[PDB]
RNA sequence: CGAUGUCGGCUCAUCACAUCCUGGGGCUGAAGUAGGUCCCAAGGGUAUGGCUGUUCGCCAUUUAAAGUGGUACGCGAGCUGGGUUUAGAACGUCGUGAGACAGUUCGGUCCCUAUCUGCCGUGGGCGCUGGAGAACUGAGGGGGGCUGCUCCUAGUACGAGAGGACCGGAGUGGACGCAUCACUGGUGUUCGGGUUGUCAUGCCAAUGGCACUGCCCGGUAGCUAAAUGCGGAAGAGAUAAGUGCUGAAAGCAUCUAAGCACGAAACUUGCCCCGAGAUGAGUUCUCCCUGACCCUUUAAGGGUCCUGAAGGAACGUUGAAGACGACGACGUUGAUAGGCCGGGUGUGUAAGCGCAGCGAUGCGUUGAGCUAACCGGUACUAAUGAACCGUGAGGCUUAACCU
RNA sequence: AAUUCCUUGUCGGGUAAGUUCCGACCUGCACGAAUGGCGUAAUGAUGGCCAGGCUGUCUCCACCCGAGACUCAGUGAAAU
RNA sequence: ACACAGGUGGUCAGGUAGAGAAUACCAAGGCGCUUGAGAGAACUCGGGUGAAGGAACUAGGCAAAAUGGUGCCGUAACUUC
RNA sequence: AGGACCGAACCGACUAAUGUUGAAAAAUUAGCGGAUGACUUGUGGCUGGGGGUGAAAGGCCAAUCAAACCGGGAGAUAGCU
């Protein structure tokens, strides 16, 4: 099937009655209204384009506003697209609610992780630090050697070095969905999903099932 | 979190007062041992009439750890002092006839059920 | 936000007694041994309370037979059943880890009698 | 950590292509005094958004 | 990596930063307008507005608290005798930042900070 | 002088 | 030889296969478990210590296994400097001696701010043929690919008995990696308190400065690991070694010549990420501009006046975004940041006053006072009307339709 | 053995494990008696080894505080 | 060579605590060291703290941590007494 | 009493880190050794180059030492670059 787009609001824990405390992440999966249906005619593939939340009336530009008010929806924050595996139809303008995960058992969550910025190789690539005493000179957390000698004569591409860590799209796979609360539009998953509290999460049914 | 070169107190009465862990058994590159974990020990201090003598190499199981154990609700049980029960090398049964101090409920499996039968608290 | 505090108020128990660091306390917890469930009492001294609402915990230190045992308890978990505050302590700290340092006659504290 | 041979004036100007200063787009005109100033800055005359604040 | 953190370091250690903010708050309370750099003025807002909050409730303990923050009896006198009654209806925002060119000596972004009376 | 190739 | 810094260790690797483990097979002097030997296979993995400067080795204890080699015996403009290889000194030996020793022993300056290539990140310009805002397909590229133990079948098959499975399943670990702070903790020189010496606020009381935050005790938010979730796969296609089916050449036989079916962690996908500068520059949806005239070599021309559109940029308030750029939110038609209010949390019963006592001090007011980054609210302060850039229906040729 | 090549001699102690250390034996390649032999209390920024305490040395790094690195304005080198 | 973190002889020397000319805070007296303003990346420098372990590091406990004052009690082998 | 002990000034220079186109052509920082003596220091003398002086390293003799520095034989000589 398809996924839903929600907002991460914190982590909590559910105390079940037997004793086991399940640490859950709360995803407020709001109503996703379909904006565009891409089909084989115009696009050569089938997919739906959804939106969630609502932007201010004047922050929405004229091309976005015309795209939204072309078919029966009000403007939300950002457009997304799900690839419709062979035999599902979602009419344009349709609000898709959260009971799609009241069906399912496991979930993968896609988000942009928290950005650590320019991180060194010890944080980024788990490099082992050099010996922090015993004579070492200005070389404790430096990367070490980065290539062999005259025969390569060059650093191989894909060398692990210091650089931007975080702030990238990552997907956590096969999380147990603990509770689907339609009355407050809450989806609770077992485990840690990517991103800071407030970033948008794409929630799909688990494909490694 | 018992590693190699950790000095452990001894919970049973095989005779050892204080032993030293020399390898955390089970798996390659393994770092630590918890309460449900077998280690290899060697004996540094013994009692003069006891069964085991100082300088022997045998096996133990940890029963108390200052790092603790984490129960599934999130509660931790942090003992004061690391403690082990000495097992035989190939028999894997305790060499003691009694056990001092309390032990943990997450030790409860068959051979260590024979251990916790002698235990004054679980 | 308003959502997380709402789920915390849904999860929490209405009844939990008022104790402080220093209070000598019995906690009775559930244990399982297969099908058979049992209650087990842990009497010690509350030496740390971590108030967070639902995530509140408290650390009870008990000198067992020869040894020192220490257990934190999730205050709102269903694995606890009762917290009977037996004795009332008169410390003037919030965390009492010097009792983790001290043993014996130096590790005792006077009564509150508020 | 030293050059192997000297870089040309060609490679000098290419590096200094990004060193160019950016001029301000435009200044603002205050409503009362009418003098030019930066955006969100008080005037040299001490006026800011139709209001004299400093003598 | 400074995520969700506050407080500016200002290239001063905590003793120098605290003593400088004590002196700058005394100068702003005494003169009712001072001229400084821009981020110093923003952290000065964050320092000097709780003192005017404290100045509304007149009590001996509040005089001693405001003495512990300012270490000048002239400043607590001007606070509890003028800016207490003057800002008693105002809730928050007793100071105003107005950006005033750049410093001549080093090209530093200057700004005025004043009370909202003038 | 350890850098010399003796 | 107008200098190519060398053994070992550390950090970081990368390739070959002559494979250590895992994977698939043939033969066995292969009953089973376990071996032996040989073929295919490089996807992933491949110890920790004692001794020694050591590599190597011996040993101890593991492991599924502790592979063999190349890379200037990889790696000193990446670190060390134990050995070796300067100058001191000594031993043994050789020499009459100065001195010498692949003979020991003690000690003994390891320089460099990266221009170019390379690599890791990150932008500015222009292009993509009118301009702009988004969402994508996906050429291609990268990441990941390890494995033990226990239980079930089943104590069956086999075997005299000791012992003891193939195939298939279920759980729980080790190492590795990703994510996040809900828990357990670390930190928390921006919060609270104790306390020593001294100086000051006139003094008592109460505070503050300095002494590494003076020394300490707890600790919010962030960040984090030791904490907590997750993941390696199942599946498909074409195969290697091997195994066959029919089957002649060679009336038989024969896996191959015609033909067909099996067959591994290797190969291509399936999983995750980047990705139209993919100049072959793609697709879809939406929005925006519908004016007059001059000149000359009347050309995809140059010029004048008027209008500046969508949108962008600048400016400001700023962000669990960040070296700077960038990215994200907001700019009063407003919760972007500070303040304020309430709560939460942390610390531990503030100051003053009253009482007790000779006083230190205790008790009451009182779980008080003070609370950083948290939470929900609130326009009190600052986010100024604007000005800036971007235009005015967008070439030629051919084809298929419609007036 | 500051001497010993063979060699990590061989035996004992310490260690789970000890080419170094300690005590021995002599097979002294190639000790040896004022270029002194062998012991020696005290001493030593002396060489070697073991134990207790203590620790970020390390497993395995994490956070914080300052000074540079980074951005802005002024000045403004160098080897090559 | 510098308005250079180096060198250079004699005299005076207060308070509080302290054995002290040590050291801490101050007086008289003199200075803030002749580029500043932001930001709060890697990494380097000087530090602070650290769960569990405690030399497993390494050529080597190198470096850090710890010990640290006064009064009394007590104190081994060996010794040139 | 002491070429006695602990430890400032003072004299030295054991270890580590930083510095390595330094703040400095030998230093800084934290620890370190001696600190009533074979001590240390001010001022002035004396010893001079195959010479001095040397608690001896071929050390020091003006940032120079297995024979200083300056000027002269001297445009030494160079089968070598």
Curated annotation (Swiss-Prot), chain A:
Matches recorded under Pfam families: Ribosomal_L3
UniProt similarity note: Belongs to the universal ribosomal protein uL3 family.
GO terms for cellular component: cytoplasm; cytosol; cytosolic large ribosomal subunit
Gene assigned in the entry: rplC
Subunit-structure text: Part of the 50S ribosomal subunit. Forms a cluster with proteins L14 and L19. In pull-down experiments interacts with CedA.
Keyword Ribonucleoprotein carried by entry: yes
Modification after translation (UniProt): Methylated by PrmB.
Keywords carried by this UniProt record: Methylation, Ribonucleoprotein, Ribosomal protein, RNA-binding, rRNA-binding
Annotated GO MF terms: rRNA binding; structural constituent of ribosome
Modification N5-methylglutamine occurs at: 150
Protein name: Large ribosomal subunit protein uL3
């Amino acid at each position: 099937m398809i996924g839903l787009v929600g907002k991460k609001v914190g982590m909590t824990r559910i105390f079940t009655e037997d004793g086991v405390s399940i640490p859950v992440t709360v995803i407020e999966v709001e109503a996703n209204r379909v904006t565009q249906v891409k089909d084989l005619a115009n696009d050569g593939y089938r997919a739906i384009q959804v939106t969630t939340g609502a932007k201010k009336a004047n922050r929405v530009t004229k091309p976005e506003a015309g795209h939204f008010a072309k078919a029966g929806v009000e403007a939300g924050r950002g457009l997304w697209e799900f690839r419709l595996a062979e035999g599902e139809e979602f009419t344009v303008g349709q609000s898709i609610s959260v009971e799609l995960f009241a069906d399912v058992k496991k979930v993968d969550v896609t988000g942009t992780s928290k950005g650590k910025g320019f991180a060194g190789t010890v944080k980024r690539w788990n490099f082992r630090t050099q010996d922090a005493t015993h004579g070492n000179s200005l070389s404790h957390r430096v990367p070490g050697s980065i290539g062999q000698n005259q025969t390569p004569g060059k650093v191989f591409k894909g060398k692990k070095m210091a650089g931007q860590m975080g702030n990238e799209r990552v997907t956590v796979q096969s999380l147990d969905v603990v509770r689907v609360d339609a009355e407050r539009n809450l989806l609770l998953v077992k485990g840690a999903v990517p991103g800071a509290t407030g970033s948008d999460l794409i929630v799909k049914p688990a494909v490694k099932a | 979190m018992i590693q190699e070169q950790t000095m452990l107190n001894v919970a049973d009465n095989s005779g050892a007062r204080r032993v030293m862990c020399i390898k955390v058994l089970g798996g390659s590159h393994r770092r630590y041992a918890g309460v449900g974990d077998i280690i290899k020990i060697t004996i540094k201090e013994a009692i003069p009439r006891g069964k085991v003598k100082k300088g022997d190499v045998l096996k133990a199981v940890v029963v108390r750890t200052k790092k603790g154990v984490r129960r599934p609700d999130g509660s931790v049980i942090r003992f004061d002092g690391n403690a082990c029960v000495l097992l035989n090398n190939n028999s894997e049964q305790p060499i003691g006839t009694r056990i001092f101090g309390p032990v943990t409920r997450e030790l409860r499996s068959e051979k260590f059920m024979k251990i916790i039968s002698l235990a004054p608290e679980v | 936000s308003n959502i997380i505090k709402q789920l915390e108020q849904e999860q929490m128990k209405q009844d939990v007694p008022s104790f402080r660091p220093g209070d000598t306390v019995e906690v009775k917890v559930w244990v399982v041994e297969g099908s058979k469930k049992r209650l087990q009492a842990f009497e010690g001294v509350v030496i740390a309370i971590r108030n967070r609402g639902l995530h509140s915990a408290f650390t009870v230190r008990k000198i067992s037979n020869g040894e020192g045992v220490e257990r934190v308890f999730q205050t709102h978990s269903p694995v606890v059943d009762s917290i009977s505050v037996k004795r009332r302590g008169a410390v003037r700290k919030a965390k009492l880890y010097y009792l983790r340092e001290r043993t014996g006659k130096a590790a005792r504290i006077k009564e509150r009698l508020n | 950590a030293v050059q192997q041979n000297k870089p040309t004036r060609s490679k000098r100007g290419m590096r200094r292509s990004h060193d160019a200063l950016t001029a301000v787009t435009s200044l603002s005109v205050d409503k009362t005094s009418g003098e030019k100033h930066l955006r969100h800055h008080i005037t040299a005359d001490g006026y800011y958004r139709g209001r004299k604040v400093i003598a | 990596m400074r995520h969700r953190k506050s407080g500016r370091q200002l290239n001063r250690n905590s003793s120098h930063r605290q003593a400088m903010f004590r002196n700058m708050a005394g100068s702003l309370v005494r003169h009712e307008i001072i001229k400084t750099t821009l981020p110093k003025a923003k952290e000065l807002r964050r320092v000097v507005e709780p003192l005017i909050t404290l100045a509304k409730t007149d009590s001996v303990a509040n005089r001693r608290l405001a003495f512990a923050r300012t270490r000048d009896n002239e400043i607590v006198a001007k606070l509890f005798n003028e800016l207490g009654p003057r800002f008693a209806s105002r809730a928050g925002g007793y100071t105003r930042i107005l950006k005033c060119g750049f410093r001549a000596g080093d090209n530093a972004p200057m700004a005025y900070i004043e009370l909202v009376d003038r | 002088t350890h850098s010399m190739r003796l």
